[PDB]
Amino acid sequence: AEKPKLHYFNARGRMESTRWLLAAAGVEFEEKFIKSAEDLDKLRNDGYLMFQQVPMVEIDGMKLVQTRAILNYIASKYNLYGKDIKERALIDMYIEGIADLGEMILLLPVCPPEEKDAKLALIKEKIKNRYFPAFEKVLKSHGQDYLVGNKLSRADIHLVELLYYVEELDSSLISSFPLLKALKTRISNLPTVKKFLQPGSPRKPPMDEKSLEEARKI
Amino acid sequence: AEKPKLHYFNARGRMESTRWLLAAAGVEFEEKFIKSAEDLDKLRNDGYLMFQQVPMVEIDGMKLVQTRAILNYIASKYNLYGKDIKERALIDMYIEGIADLGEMILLLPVCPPEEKDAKLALIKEKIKNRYFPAFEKVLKSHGQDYLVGNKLSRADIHLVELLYYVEELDSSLISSFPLLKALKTRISNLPTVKKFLQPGSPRKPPMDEKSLEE
């Protein structure tokens, strides 16, 4: 019946991969933006947040916190977690790599300014030499359109999301990886994702530098 | 039916929670310790580490890397991931909390020394104010012996592992949490876990100052 309700800042942050996944699955959701310290305190004092944190998603009568919990639940419900325990293993392995990399990119903006130069270079080296090669190799090994089981799964969605963030960081990093490029294009033209990528969707922009040091106040 | 094979340093690190999970499920496994930079290099070069890192576990024909992938697979295989999607959600929410706190503790002795006292104080605050209250609350909510579905799940095992690390860090942290102290004892007395906690198991010691020149 009910639309998932997403409690987060009006920003990408740790809720954006859920927006991508729900949108990819064709699921219409509502959002309730935390705009002040008091909004967050009200979620806390109302007992909505198990560990005092957002993201939180109201879905099927649960108040799910922890990004991975929310995502695991959504992906099973909408058949984007593979067909069995072994396909789930490949998906989890792949998406956890994506998450480790995504986490490095997510936190880069709060990086101590004196180590931003070093770290950015490292993230680029890891993208070039560790992550992109690993996914290019998987796609080459089986020659199929999707990462796992020859059908759309959360892994394709989480990877493609990440390809957009890497493109924002440095458009050249994907250039020597043709199969990642083709995957990006295919996934981006699935009706649901195409709609999500179009102006007007719930997809969120990059956090700007002026509007992050303002989201510290909460 | 190969025995699962765990490739990791001869240390706790990021493989310990898998050692606890397998042992708790009564699953006999083997370990191949990385002792040199060359051991790691050979695994990387021979294509067995998808992201050039361990932990890696050989199980059911896969070379599984990423802790969470390894743990999720083992939990499902041995019926410690609950009965349906909604129990998995509760379990996931609990264990992700456990892993966030776990991660902080894991990385503490690698903090630059002039931050190390501040990090510890923040960990203890989170333990007393965030994490222990959350898990005490769940235990009192249903008053049962297990976190979820009135039967042993990975959540019990991951939590009780963490209560052992929290004990090592500060023995007083658990003192105002009687349901947590009771879970530690009960889980620790399950035959499999009891064996694991006894000498001669694959359970690993804390790192010592001198061992960290690894």
How far is B135 from B147, CA to CA, in rounded Å? 8
How far is A71 from A88, CA to CA, in rounded Å? 13
Contact B72 A64 (CB under 8 A): no
Which of A50, A85, A97 lies closest to B97 in CB terms?
Answer: A50
Q: Between the CA of residue B22 and those of A70, B3, B29, B34, B124, what are the distances in Å?
A: 25, 11, 8, 20, 29
How far is A20 from A202, CA to CA, in rounded Å? 9
Q: How many CB pairs below 8 Å do chains A and B form together?
A: 79
| N-terminal to C-terminal alpha carbon distance within chain A | 33
How far is A23 from A196, CA to CA, in rounded Å? 6
Pairing of strands B30-34, B5-9: parallel
CB B11 within 8 Å of CB B207: yes
Contact A100 B51 (CB under 8 A): yes
**Is residue A66 exposed (0-12), middle (13-18) or buried (19+ Cβ within 10 Å)?**
buried
Q: How far is Cα of residue B118 from the mean position of the Cα atoms in its chain?
A: 24
How far is B177 from A12, CA to CA, in rounded Å? 36
A213 to chain B, any CB pair closer than 8 A? The answer is no
**Who's near A144: CB < 8 A, 6+ residues apart?**
A150
Domains of chain A, each with CATH number or no CATH: 1-80+190-208 (3.40.30.10), 81-189 (1.20.1050.10)
**Who's near A6: CB < 8 A, 6+ residues apart?**
A15, A18, A19, A29, A30, A31, A32, A55, A56, A57
Q: Between the CA of residue A160 and those of A13, A64, A79, A183, B122, what are the distances in Å?
A: 17, 25, 18, 8, 36
Contact A73 B52 (CB under 8 A): no
How far is A74 from A23, CA to CA, in rounded Å? 11
Contact B93 A69 (CB under 8 A): yes
In this structure, chain B runs to a length of 214
CB A34 within 8 Å of CB A9: yes
A47 phi-psi bin (left φ>0, alpha ψ -120 to 50, beta other): left
Task: Report which DSSP code applies to B202.
Answer: S
By what technique were these coordinates determined? X-ray
Contact B77 A85 (CB under 8 A): yes
B102 to chain A, any CB pair closer than 8 A? The answer is no
Contacts of B76 in chain A (CB under 8 A): 85, 88
Contacts of A76 in chain B (CB under 8 A): 85, 88
How far is A82 from A84, CA to CA, in rounded Å? 6
Q: Write out residues 68-87 of A within 8 Å (CB-CB) of B.
A: 68-69, 72-73, 76-77, 85-86
Contact B85 A68 (CB under 8 A): no
Tokens 């297990």 appear where?
B146
